[PDB]
Amino acid sequence: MYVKLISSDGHEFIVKREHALTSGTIKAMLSGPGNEVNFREIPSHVLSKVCMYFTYKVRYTNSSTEIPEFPIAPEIALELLMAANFLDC
Amino acid sequence: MDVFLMIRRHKTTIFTDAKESSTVFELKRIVEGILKRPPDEQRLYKDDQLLDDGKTLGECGFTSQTARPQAPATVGLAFRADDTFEALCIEPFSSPPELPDVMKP
Amino acid sequence: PRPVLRSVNSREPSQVIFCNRSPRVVLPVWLNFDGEPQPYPTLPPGTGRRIHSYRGHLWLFRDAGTHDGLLVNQTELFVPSLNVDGQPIFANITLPVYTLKERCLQVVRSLVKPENYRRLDIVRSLYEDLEDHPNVQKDLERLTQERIAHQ
Amino acid sequence: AMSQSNRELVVDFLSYKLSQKGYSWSQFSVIPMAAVKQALREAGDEFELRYRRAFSDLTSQLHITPGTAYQSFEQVVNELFRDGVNWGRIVAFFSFGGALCVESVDKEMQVLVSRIAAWMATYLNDHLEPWIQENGGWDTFVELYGN
């Protein structure tokens, strides 16, 4: 069961619904009236990194093992902070 | 042992996982479920290397060290456009801006 | 009034292994008999230490440098029980799965001098998020409120 | 009887704590007494080094001035023994009196040192001697806490 997240530059990200629901904003939009979510102002380099976060969160949540650090390059940190705040994840 | 993948064609990126022991053919069946093209209408690539249907993802170089949830490995996808395959084409993601002064050492 | 989150003076020895399974330098924090947090010596990443504690004592674990919260046996609080068959109690210290927002705040804090947070080209609410550093006191308030809602 | 011995223990312990800070007692003025005094001195040192900071600071709850009543001291010391008496809490009580005497000297209220000694002797006689009688006396304190 997959959903489609679309970036400002028209990149389509196909992710498991369970993964996309990690985002409070995406959960609210998918649970609302009238599947895809289109983000007019989040570019592909940011949205692809957000999808990697969803994969990481679902894999390592409730894990009894050592979990790795979620890595963030300095170059994307500010944009990713703004997107994480906007997307509630 | 799970590997974490981005299956990429044109402006499409699929986020999924598979077993290191699972085959290229089995990954094509995953793609068929999502993008509705059968395995014989798909080519899968690691960089510019065409992957043989028989090989496991591990035998292709997709391991848990190189294909992590937080840093997935890229698999290129091309569709059979007629009797022949389209060229492998993956549109690059956008680029971040210059690092601001206050975020430099 | 005795704080809800405090060590019990059980006087009952419990041998514990603090196992740092995180890439952070870990500051163990003991809640004393009046619930005051008391820092103990740091554990480098991927190191284990056998330590003398007591049944019904309460421990938290933080990043020694940034004060980011860590997990112990997948939860925030560690309480030693009595050793069965003379085997020590394992305190397995790991990273939580931080929210992407908290992880981004951690990285920006690591890259920017505190005096320069206010110069970042971000909305004021995000500047205030950066400035509101994690701390034990904030977490104990929330964990106290959680248990009051439960009790 | 036990009253006089308990009074002597108070004066010995307070004399020790003042001596450690560089003050002498004189200016402020059958059990194995020598063995009890030495064990109480060592137990107080161990309490202050290892244990005091694990508990609520009672010096935050009592600020003794010339006007302070015994009842205020008794109420704060009662908190120490809220869950009953044991040897460790008796050591804490001695250490608390020592800290009050040092604080009084620091704040130039040297007259309170003799008064705190009298208060400790009263509390010991009224609240603690019956428990001591019941729990093997100061002899058993020396067995458990002595060198």
Side-chain angles (χ1 to χ4, degrees), chain A residues 50 53 56-57 60-72 74 77-78 80-82 84-85 89, chain C residues 21-24 74 94-101 103-108 111 120-122 126 129-130:
Chain A
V50 169
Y53 176 76
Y56 170 89
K57 183 274 175 190
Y60 289 119
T61 289
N62 296 339
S63 180
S64 68
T65 76
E66 171 164 8
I67 84 158
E69 198 81 68
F70 188 76
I72 305 175
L78 222 49
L80 193 64
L81 174 59
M82 291 183 287
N85 185 52
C89 63
Chain C
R21 301 186 201 276
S22 90
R24 310 305 189 79
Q74 292 183 87
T94 63
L95 291 177
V97 179
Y98 298 115
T99 67
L100 182 56
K101 181 177 175 181
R103 183 59 190 134
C104 289
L105 288 173
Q106 287 172 12
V107 167
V108 171
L111 295 172
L120 288 169
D121 190 11
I122 58 184
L126 272 182
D129 289 339
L130 281 171

Side-chain angles (χ1 to χ4, degrees), chain D residues 69-117:
Chain D
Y70 170 70
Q71 279 67 30
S72 297
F73 170 86
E74 184 187 32
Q75 282 173 31
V76 169
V77 173
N78 282 173
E79 257 301 280
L80 209 173
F81 297 110
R82 64 197 184 182
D83 292 337
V85 180
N86 67 38
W87 288 121
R89 291 167 191 172
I90 293 175
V91 172
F93 159 81
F94 275 89
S95 287
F96 179 50
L100 291 172
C101 285
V102 166
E103 174 62 11
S104 295
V105 174
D106 293 352
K107 291 289 176 286
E108 302 184 4
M109 296 183 292
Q110 288 91 336
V111 167
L112 294 180
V113 173
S114 76
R115 188 171 300 169
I116 294 160

Side-chain angles (χ1 to χ4, degrees), chain A residues 6-42:
Chain A
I6 306 164
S7 68
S8 59
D9 50 329
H11 274 272
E12 310 189 349
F13 299 98
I14 302 172
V15 304
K16 297 223 216 314
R17 191 172 201 101
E18 171 188 24
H19 292 214
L21 293 190
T22 296
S23 161
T25 302
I26 295 171
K27 176 172 185 175
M29 293 172 76
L30 287 177
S31 299
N35 295 74
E36 47 181 58
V37 179
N38 192 312
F39 291 113
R40 190 156 182 179
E41 301 295 346
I42 302 179

Side-chain angles (χ1 to χ4, degrees), chain B residues 36-50:
Chain B
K36 314 305 179 189
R37 299 292 294 269
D40 73 351
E41 292 180 26
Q42 298 177 38
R43 284 174 167 184
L44 295 181
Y45 292 80
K46 185 180 189 299
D47 303 323
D48 292 325
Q49 178 61 53
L50 181 61

Side-chain angles (χ1 to χ4, degrees), chain B residues 10-70:
Chain B
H10 289 205
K11 272 192 165 172
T12 306
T13 299
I14 299 165
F15 282 81
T16 193
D17 57 65
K19 303 290 162 186
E20 269 204 41
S21 61
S22 71
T23 61
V24 168
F25 185 81
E26 282 176 321
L27 192 58
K28 291 179 175 191
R29 286 289 187 198
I30 296 294
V31 168
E32 172 177 39
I34 298 162
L35 293 184
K36 314 305 179 189
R37 299 292 294 269
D40 73 351
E41 292 180 26
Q42 298 177 38
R43 284 174 167 184
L44 295 181
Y45 292 80
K46 185 180 189 299
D47 303 323
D48 292 325
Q49 178 61 53
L50 181 61
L51 301 183
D52 194 284
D53 284 349
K55 291 197 190 168
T56 72
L57 302 187
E59 289 162 20
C60 297
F62 303 116
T63 69
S64 294
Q65 278 285 108
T66 59
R68 306 164 176 193
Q70 63 274 13

